[PDB]
Amino acid sequence: MAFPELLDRVGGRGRFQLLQAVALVTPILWVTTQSMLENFSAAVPHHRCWVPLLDNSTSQASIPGDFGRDVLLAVSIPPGPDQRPHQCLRFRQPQWQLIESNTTATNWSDADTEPCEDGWVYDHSTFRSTIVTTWDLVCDSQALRPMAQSIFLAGILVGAAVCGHASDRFGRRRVLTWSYLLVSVSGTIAALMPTFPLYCLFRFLVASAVAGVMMNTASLLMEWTSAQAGPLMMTLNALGFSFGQVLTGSVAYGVRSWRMLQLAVSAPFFLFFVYSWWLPESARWLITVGRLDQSLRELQRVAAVNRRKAEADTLTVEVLRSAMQEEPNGNQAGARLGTLLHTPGLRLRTFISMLCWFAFGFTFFGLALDLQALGSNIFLLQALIGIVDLPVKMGSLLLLSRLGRRLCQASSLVLPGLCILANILVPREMGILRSSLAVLGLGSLGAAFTCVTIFSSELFPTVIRMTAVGLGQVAARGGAILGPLVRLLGVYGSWLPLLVYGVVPVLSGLAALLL
Ligand SMILES: CCc1oc2ccccc2c1C(=O)c1cc(Br)c(O)c(Br)c1
């Protein structure tokens, strides 16, 4: 009397699973908002150096002559690479000579310019305040944003590991609801810190709790349903991320202050926590540990929801004990890691699998967090990524049976990569075509994640099937951390970050055909 018999006899498809799927997919949207808020809360607006002549009204009253704002801006600030006033320099001694056109204003030495020691001036047309405006992440401090994003992703990884151990030892629902509470508390606290390091630490905690809640939601959604309806729930979970993208765009358009935006994003998790208590605990894990009475109570409850009390009556403790006896043992999990790499037949498939996992995190998170440089309307670009993803994710499922198994991975990585590499070659004059290629590039990478999850299981044997999938997750998380740090290469040239973000997926796709 295995557990699947009990799950089928109490009802696997009836009602209850739909309600549980809704209640566990709703928080995924806000999980996505928390993950991708860093694009909007930390946007860098156009800035110019602070000038006593222009900004200070006391010096404004002392100006001899009614000089226009553009004239004074040209007098005070050297021109920049894009014919705009330069961001990080200022004339120490106001140059009245530059106004006259009889002198070619080209012989300016760096010794005549000094760093902006009196602050900066930011435009507030599109954003009222970001962390860059608040803590002056400009010039010499421009490299700290990728550090913050990498800290967030490392927090995701550490939280995933810690919550894995905690859910293995204590259960699913308890860790899930405590993750809800910790998300809410940590976000609310982070929305009020005065200094940058405290903000980074509390974002680290938020990321840890987000990883925990995502993993526990996935596990609970998978475990309470029969194997026949698993892919439908996985597809719903995948669509949850696109809906979260759309929600992130809408909410970021709604609120233009980073503190208020963070508070609004972190608020609904308390409402999730308050009702998370009513959710039934997973019966299989309760059977595994040995709390037969609690598992029987949950089984009776869930069968009562399915309006199947007549079949629910005959459940007995001895059947539960037999099911516990029939549970497979996890002792061999220690040696499953070694046999993946030591076996030559298994070694080559793992390396190809890891590269596919690695390419997704490295490419997507290095670009999905940098929509500022890919276009002007960040609000429209954020929503379009979610919108384009849905047709591609569903369309890729149909493509599986027709063109075969092997060709799927290569096509799902080469095409998104080539679009990114085509971004450089397109002239900057055509902005409409320039932005469209980037949208299709990152938008199509969503089908890559969905494909690899299904693909990895079927290759490996059932004995080590679970372990191999876990290794791919670690590589994807590890590749995410290295993503934002690539943007530091932009000082050499603007095309350098895009070349790495395009070349890497292509090689991963081209090496994927050898499986
Ligand atoms: C925003 C969700 C998320 O944040 C992470 C941080 C570190 C490693 C993985 C993730 C991760 C995913 O797994 C993921 C999976 C699928 Br399928 C998607 O279509 C999108 Br979009 C994201």
For the chain, the domains span 1-44+141-327, 47-122, 333-515
- Ligand 1 midpoint to CA 489 (Å): 25
User: Which residues does residue 113 pair with via DSSP β-bridges, in sequence order?
Assistant: 91
Calpha distance 196→42 (Å, rounded)? 12
Under 8 Å between Cβ of 255 and 126: no
- Ligand 1 midpoint to CA 31 (Å): 10
- Residue 94 sits at the vertex; the CA angle it makes with 89 and 97, to the nearest 5 degrees, is 110
Under 8 Å between Cβ of 85 and 49: yes
Token reading at 94: 């106001």
Q: Which distant-in-sequence residues (6+ apart) come within 8 Å of 220 by Cβ?
A: 20, 24, 172, 173, 176, 279, 282
- Identify how the structure was determined: cryo-EM
The minimum-distance atom of ligand 1 relative to the CA of 237 is 17
Q: Parallel, antiparallel, or unpaired for β 47-49 and 120-122?
A: antiparallel
Under 8 Å between Cβ of 76 and 91: yes
Under 8 Å between Cβ of 420 and 502: yes
- Ligand 1 midpoint to CA 248 (Å): 14
Helix residue ranges per DSSP H, 56-195: 57-60, 69-76, 131-135, 144-170, 173-190
Q: Which distant-in-sequence residues (6+ apart) come within 8 Å of 191 by Cβ?
A: 259, 262, 263, 266
Calpha distance 241→250 (Å, rounded)? 14
The minimum-distance atom of ligand 1 relative to the CA of 393 is 19
Under 8 Å between Cβ of 501 and 335: no
Calpha distance 463→453 (Å, rounded)? 17
The minimum-distance atom of ligand 1 relative to the CA of 364 is 21
Calpha distance 350→356 (Å, rounded)? 10
CA distances from 1 to 5, 8, 298, 463 (A): 7, 12, 18, 22
Q: Whose CA is nearest to atom 22 of ligand 1?
A: 241
Task: Tell me 56's DSSP state.
Answer: -
Calpha distance 356→353 (Å, rounded)? 5
The enclosing H or E element of 286 equals helix 283-289
Which among 241, 243, 235 has a CA at the least distance from the CA of 214? 241
Q: How far apart are the first and last CA of the chain?
A: 38
The minimum-distance atom of ligand 1 relative to the CA of 450 is 17
* Pocket-forming residues, ligand 1, beta carbon under 6 Å: 32, 35, 153, 156, 238, 241, 361, 446, 449-450, 476-477, 480
Calpha distance 377→374 (Å, rounded)? 9
Under 8 Å between Cβ of 234 and 377: no
- Looking at this protein, which amino acid is placed at residue 27? P
Q: How many CA atoms lie within 13 A of 429 on its CB side?
A: 1
- Ligand 1 midpoint to CA 35 (Å): 9
Dump the DSSP string for 424-442. Answer: HHS-TT-HHHHHHHHHHHH
CATH topology of domain 1-44+141-327: Growth Hormone; Chain: A; (1.20.1250)
Calpha distance 129→191 (Å, rounded)? 13
Calpha distance 264→187 (Å, rounded)? 10
Dump the DSSP string for 169-208. Answer: HH-SHHHHHHHHHHHHHHHHHHTT-SSHHHHHHHHHHHHH
- Ligand 1 midpoint to CA 468 (Å): 18
Please list, residue by residue across 343-367, b when 16 or more beta carbons sit within 10 angstroms of its beta carbon and e when fewer do. Answer: eeebeebbebbbbbbbbbbbbbbbb
Cα 371 to its chain centre, rounded Å, is 13
Under 8 Å between Cβ of 364 and 438: no
3-state SS assignment for residue 331: coil
- Ligand 1 midpoint to CA 172 (Å): 21
Q: Whose CA is nearest to atom 4 of ligand 1?
A: 35
CATH topology of domain 333-515: Growth Hormone; Chain: A; (1.20.1250)
Work out the number of other CB atoms within 10 angstroms of the CB of residue 221.
Answer: 21
Token reading at 106: 């080209």
Query: Is residue 266 exposed (0-12), middle (13-18) or buried (19+ Cβ within 10 Å)?
Result: buried
Please list, residue by residue across 44-79, b when 16 or more beta carbons sit within 10 angstroms of its beta carbon and e when fewer do. Answer: beebbbbbebbeeeeeeeeeeeeeeeeebbbbbbbe
Q: Which long-range contacts (CB under 8 A, 24 or more apart) does 403-408 make?
A: 405/455, 406/513, 406/515, 407/513, 408/451, 408/455
- 212 Rama sector, left if φ>0, alpha if ψ -120 to 50, beta otherwise: alpha
Rg (CA), the chain: 28
Query: Is residue 342 exposed (0-12), middle (13-18) or buried (19+ Cβ within 10 Å)?
Result: exposed
Calpha distance 65→6 (Å, rounded)? 89
- Ligand 1 midpoint to CA 315 (Å): 40
Cα 86 to its chain centre, rounded Å, is 33
Under 8 Å between Cβ of 132 and 54: no
Under 8 Å between Cβ of 308 and 14: yes
Under 8 Å between Cβ of 31 and 214: yes
Q: Which distant-in-sequence residues (6+ apart) come within 8 Å of 155 by Cβ?
A: 203, 204, 205, 206, 207, 208, 211
Calpha distance 87→268 (Å, rounded)? 39
- Looking at this protein, which amino acid is placed at residue 79? P
Calpha distance 457→455 (Å, rounded)? 6
Helix residue ranges per DSSP H, 317-464: 317-326, 333-342, 344-367, 378-403, 406-425, 431-459
Task: Tell me 91's DSSP state.
Answer: E
**Helix, strand, coil share (%) of the chain residues, nearest 5:** 75, 5, 25
Under 8 Å between Cβ of 328 and 3: no
